Design a protein around this nucleic acid. Sequence first.
DNA 1: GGGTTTCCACTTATTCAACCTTTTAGG
DNA 2: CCCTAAAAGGTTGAATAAGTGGAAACC
Length: 295
Amino acid sequence: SINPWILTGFADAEGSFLLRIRKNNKSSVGYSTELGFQITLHNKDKSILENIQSTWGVGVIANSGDNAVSLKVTRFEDLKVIIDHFEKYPLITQKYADYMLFKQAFNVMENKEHLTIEGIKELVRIKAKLNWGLTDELKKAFPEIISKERSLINKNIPNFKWLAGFTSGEGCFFVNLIKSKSKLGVQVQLVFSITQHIRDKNLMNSLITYLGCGYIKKKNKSEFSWLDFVVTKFSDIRDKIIPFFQEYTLIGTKLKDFEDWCKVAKLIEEKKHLTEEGLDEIKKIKLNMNKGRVF
DNA sequence: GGGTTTCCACTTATTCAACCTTTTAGG
DNA sequence: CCCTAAAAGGTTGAATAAGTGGAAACC
Ligand SMILES: [Ca+2]
Ligand SMILES: [Ca+2]
Ligand SMILES: [Ca+2]
């Protein structure tokens, strides 16, 4: 079982809303629809999608390839459980707009309007603003649907447990080894990062006030660019970040990386990172965390 | 048969997470 | 000058997000 604010936070990170408008000869209006919500994680974290499936009592889980597992909810009657949860515990990222389009599509299909050509047209207008918008095929079939206008989402973090769910998705507990010509040769630096597209710059900035520490780093790769909420000062990590997530527990395999992160934190707090044996212990923990974990 | 929904194997594109080094701050 | 800590500054690839083909299940 999972906490409802924890789940929305995770759904802001991972999770996605789908609207399929598929050409289908056997449909009277020539199109069939499929609506729902889905999350795709590494096989690593299939436990998360089992706890969500069990808390909602809805969703089917299936492999999304060799390295990935998927939780998909499409059965139309079952999306009421999705909508009921997100109405009481709403998303706060730009995905909240994708959710509202999804809810608008729900009302279309609930009123059986998707079986009318006009209802398909409204669904194509909803799809045009949803996620990556219209397909080439749907653009060709509907050259009049042009608005890719996205509503702007701006909400505050509604709950401590929300950030714990979001950090379970976009968080990273990293142990950096700054190599130098010193006697030890390396400086151990704990880094806590939360990554997000520049779509939610104001939400990323708000973390600095919400947690009372950190700063924002802008990264880019060719046409794409994102942000990072970064904490590198150790006193903030020891007094704020670790006590925060120790009281609002994370979920998934990323939790085990946080526990090892705290193990390194106790060692540096004791100045053991200045020694040869203490620095070797930190390296053995860093090797077994994150991409080095044995499962 | 004439339609509609749901499931499941699977793909694609990118936004992530995780990993690096060099430099500056601060005592 | 000495010292380590914190910040600045990237790159990378895959776990994500988002979507697709096909067809069994349904009405
Ligand atoms: Ca995300
Ligand atoms: Ca994640
Ligand atoms: Ca993510």
